[PDB]
Hints:
- The chain has strands at about 5, 10-15, 20, 35-40, 40, 50, 60-65, 75-80, 85-90, 95, 100-105, 110-120, 120-125, 135, 145-150, 155-160, 160-165.
- By secondary structure, it is mainly β.
- The protein folds into two domains: about 1-80, Immunoglobulins (Immunoglobulin-like, Sandwich); about 80-168, Immunoglobulins (Immunoglobulin-like, Sandwich).
- Strand 12 and strand 13 (about 120-125) form a beta hairpin.
- The site of one 2-acetamido-2-deoxy-beta-D-glucopyranose has 3 residues, from loops.
- GO terms for molecular function: high-affinity IgE receptor activity; IgE binding.
- This is High affinity immunoglobulin epsilon receptor subunit alpha.
- It is a single-pass type I membrane protein.
Amino acid sequence: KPKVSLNPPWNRIFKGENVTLTCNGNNFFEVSSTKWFHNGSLSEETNSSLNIVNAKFEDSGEYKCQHQQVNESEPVYLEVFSDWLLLQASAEVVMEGQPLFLRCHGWRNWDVYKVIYYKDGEALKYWYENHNISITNATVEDSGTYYCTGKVWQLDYESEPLNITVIK
Ligand SMILES: *[C@@H]1O[C@H](CO)[C@@H](O[C@@H]2O[C@H](CO)[C@@H](O[C@@H]3O[C@H](CO)[C@@H](O)[C@H](O)[C@@H]3O)[C@H](O)[C@H]2NC(C)=O)[C@H](O)[C@H]1NC(C)=O
Ligand SMILES: *[C@@H]1O[C@H](CO)[C@@H](O[C@@H]2O[C@H](CO)[C@@H](O)[C@H](O)[C@H]2NC(C)=O)[C@H](O)[C@H]1NC(C)=O
Ligand SMILES: *[C@@H]1O[C@H](CO)[C@@H](O[C@@H]2O[C@H](CO)[C@@H](O)[C@H](O)[C@H]2NC(C)=O)[C@H](O)[C@H]1NC(C)=O
Ligand SMILES: *[C@@H]1O[C@H](CO)[C@@H](O)[C@H](O)[C@H]1NC(C)=O
Ligand SMILES: *[C@@H]1O[C@H](CO)[C@@H](O)[C@H](O)[C@H]1NC(C)=O
Ligand SMILES: *[C@@H]1O[C@H](CO)[C@@H](O)[C@H](O)[C@H]1NC(C)=O
Ligand SMILES: *[C@@H]1O[C@H](CO)[C@@H](O)[C@H](O)[C@H]1NC(C)=O
């Protein structure tokens, strides 16, 4: 029962950014026989750590790993974007009580100011130099649709809206 982990945790990334997919293993692993299935199609890497460099739209997809005698892991979907601001979430679905981190991500990792996060059309939090609205203990009422607004350079921008569900 393997489980694909990511680093950054962000599973919604811009174009050209890099992400690393590690197969069920927190720190140190042994085997050299690891399988990767990008969109189902077997991959060319064997190492347990499948890196992804300059993010091309084609990288967006469904992945998974399996060992010699283990049933393939629950696929994970990676989406790549091109836009001024992208709203990133730790996980999109959560178990009541778990942690939750949302991030109003600027393009080219620039700097965003006058930030405001919104949940279900309501103003929620606000800062100058931006922040990362974080949640330790997650309530089910936290489930909703978020999006953020901010000033890049000297213009305002709105982010694509994102759904989030906290089940019990
Ligand atoms: C795995 O399957 C997914 C299908 O969801 C593939 O992702 C899709 O890839 C295409 C081509 O990169 C994306 O569309 C492109 O968008 C640009 C910009 O809007 C446009 O100018 C191009 O003409 C093209 O339409 C498409 O949106 C994307 N799907 C999603 C949801 O992001 C992915 O490429 C597949 N992986 C492999 C290795 O085939
Ligand atoms: C993705 O990885 C690349 C490679 O490490 C990063 O760009 C590197 O930038 C350094 C400058 O310190 C150069 O020495 C390398 O040659 C560059 N690598 C490549 C492949 O061009 C890049 O910054 C990473 N992406 C992000 C978002 O940080
Ligand atoms: C987020 O979830 C909401 C539902 O909570 C989706 O909105 C519904 O969309 C369907 C069809 O698009 C409509 O029939 C419903 O009336 C909508 N509900 C509301 C309250 O507007 C929404 O499409 C989802 N968005 C994403 C990005 O997944
Ligand atoms: C290759 O695998 C080892 C562990 O077997 C790991 O420490 C290392 O980071 C991996 N290298 C790459 C490029 O994935
Ligand atoms: C492993 O996969 C087989 C089918 O190939 C399935 O019967 C079995 O239940 C799986 N292992 C576990 C722990 O579920
Ligand atoms: C908060 O978000 C920023 C983005 O500006 C990121 O670089 C940083 O690592 C995050 N801080 C923490 C403590 O996770
Ligand atoms: C999380 O918060 C709930 C109340 O909202 C509380 O009952 C529970 O003990 C908290 N969990 C932890 C680990 O403190």
